[PDB]
DNA sequence: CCCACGGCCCATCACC
DNA sequence: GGTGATGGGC
DNA sequence: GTGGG
């Protein structure tokens, strides 16, 4: 339930957003992400810091957060940071895809603190920069189930029709079944490409998804990996569809099910069935999934040629990608 | 007291 | 021209 | 900031 204790979790997620962009502290911007996770799956509205700090993840010091937070309703130190410019204004402009932390301070250190003092300033924004400034507005609105099936119809259509031996899987929290997504994930892989191997192969399918005018803009493309931005045809009478985020890896087919199993199912799922792995003498990555010997020395790769054999290996239970929340 | 904390591709920067 | 470091994304 | 060596 979010009414819980959203006012603790916005308070956490806050303080982890001007860790992570402002501070350039990313392992306090995951220390304060971790303890707004267990604190938002938590069954009742928490009373006290100490009744928080039984939670793993949740220190000393958001203990005493809390405390303040429920005694006053406040965080003194974030109504200050929320009220300073130079910090608020860091904040903002990490928003814009392909300005984080860095880029944010020195904008802001010669006076750019606006999307406007940006569009008057864009000599100095790199061709990322340039699209996510243009796109802000459509990047951070999310994309609803239905769009995403209109968006995979036209990805798998125009990915045959290049060659019919191409693979494409749309993963991520669509293949989990998520009503909406953030983003369009899709792997592709071919007969022709294995780990014992053509650059062509991911280039020829942008370019089919640029004939038919899906792919509208290119953030960053090599033979492996490919970020851009699509966006749904519309019908005259009605309006655009939004600018959206998607992103093709082209991987081995020998390594293809290890990547679907990876880039499917949630973050927090993936640590998990790592971590079982390794319980079973196996380390699994995005890649493969290799044995422990008795000293901790990883062995060859196993052949994978579903994601159920990965499943297998490690004696799991299969678990359907709708059922990979945790 | 001290260190780890998912890790890799791609664009561009710093430097030679 | 080239290599390696850094920033950024996810 | 939290956990743990
Ligand atoms: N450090 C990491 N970087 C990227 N992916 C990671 C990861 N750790 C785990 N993953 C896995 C878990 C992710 O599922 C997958 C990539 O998906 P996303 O697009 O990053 N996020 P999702 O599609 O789930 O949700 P939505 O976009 O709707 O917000 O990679
Ligand atoms: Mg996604
Ligand atoms: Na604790
Ligand atoms: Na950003």
């Given at each position: 339930?979010?009414?819980?204790?959203?006012g603790?979790?916005?308070?956490?997620?806050?303080l982890?957003?001007?860790?992570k962009?402002?501070?350039?502290?990313?392992?306090?911007?995951?220390?304060?992400?971790?303890?707004?996770?267990?604190?938002?799956?938590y069954?009742?509205?928490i009373?006290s810091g100490?009744?928080?700090?039984?939670?793993?993840?949740?220190?000393?010091?958001?203990?005493?957060?809390?405390?303040?937070?429920?005694a006053?309703?406040?965080?003194?130190?974030?109504?200050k940071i929320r009220q300073?410019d130079?910090?608020?204004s860091?904040n903002?402009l990490?928003?814009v895809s392909?300005?984080?932390?860095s880029?944010?301070?020195?904008f802001?250190?010669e006076?750019?603190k606006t999307?406007?003092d940006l569009r008057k300033?864009?000599?100095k924004?790199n061709?990322?920069?340039?699209?996510?400034?243009?796109?802000?507005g459509?990047?951070?609105?999310?994309?609803?189930?239905?769009e995403?099936?209109?968006m995979?119809?036209?990805?798998?259509?125009?990915?045959?029709?290049?060659?019919?031996?191409?693979?494409?899987?749309?993963?991520?929290?669509?293949?989990?079944?998520?009503?909406?997504?953030?983003?369009?994930?899709?792997?592709?892989?071919?007969p022709?490409?294995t780990?014992?191997?053509?650059?062509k192969?991911?280039?020829?399918?942008?370019?089919?998804?640029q004939?038919?005018?899906?792919?509208?803009?290119?953030?960053?493309?090599?033979?492996?990996?490919?970020m851009?931005?699509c966006?749904?045809?519309?019908?005259?009478?009605?309006?655009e569809?939004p600018?959206?985020?998607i992103d093709?890896?082209?991987i081995?087919?020998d390594?293809?099910?290890?990547?679907?199993?990876?880039f499917?199912?949630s973050d927090?799922?993936?640590?998990?069935?790592?971590?079982?792995?390794?319980?079973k003498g196996?380390?699994?990555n995005?890649y493969?999934?290799?044995?422990?010997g008795?000293?901790?020395?990883?062995?060859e790769?196993?052949?994978?040629?579903?994601e159920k054999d990965?499943?297998?290996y490690?004696?799991?239970?299969?678990?359907?990608?709708?059922d990979?929340?945790?």
């Amino acid at each position: 339930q979010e009414t819980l204790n959203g006012g603790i979790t916005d308070m956490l997620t806050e303080l982890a957003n001007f860790e992570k962009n402002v501070s350039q502290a990313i392992h306090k911007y995951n220390a304060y992400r971790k303890a707004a996770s267990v604190i938002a799956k938590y069954p009742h509205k928490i009373k006290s810091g100490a009744e928080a700090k039984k939670l793993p993840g949740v220190g000393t010091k958001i203990a005493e957060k809390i405390d303040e937070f429920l005694a006053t309703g406040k965080l003194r130190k974030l109504e200050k940071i929320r009220q300073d410019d130079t910090s608020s204004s860091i904040n903002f402009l990490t928003r814009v895809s392909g300005i984080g932390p860095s880029a944010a301070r020195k904008f802001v250190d010669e006076g750019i603190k606006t999307l406007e003092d940006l569009r008057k300033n864009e000599d100095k924004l790199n061709h990322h920069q340039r699209i996510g400034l243009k796109y802000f507005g459509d990047f951070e609105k999310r994309i609803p189930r239905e769009e995403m099936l209109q968006m995979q119809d036209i990805v798998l259509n125009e990915v045959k029709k290049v060659d019919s031996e191409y693979i494409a899987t749309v993963c991520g929290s669509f293949r989990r079944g998520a009503e909406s997504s953030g983003d369009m994930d899709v792997l592709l892989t071919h007969p022709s490409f294995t780990s014992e191997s053509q650059p062509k192969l991911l280039h020829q399918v942008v370019e089919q998804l640029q004939k038919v005018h899906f792919i509208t803009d290119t953030l960053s493309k090599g033979e492996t990996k490919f970020m851009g931005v699509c966006q749904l045809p519309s019908k005259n009478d009605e309006k655009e569809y939004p600018h959206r985020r998607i992103d093709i890896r082209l991987i081995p087919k020998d390594q293809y099910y290890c990547g679907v199993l990876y880039f499917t199912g949630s973050d927090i799922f993936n640590k998990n069935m790592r971590a079982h792995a390794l319980e079973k003498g196996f380390t699994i990555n995005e890649y493969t999934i290799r044995p422990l010997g008795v000293t901790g020395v990883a062995g060859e790769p196993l052949p994978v040629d579903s994601e159920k054999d990965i499943f297998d290996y490690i004696q799991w239970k299969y678990r359907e990608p709708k059922d990979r929340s945790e």
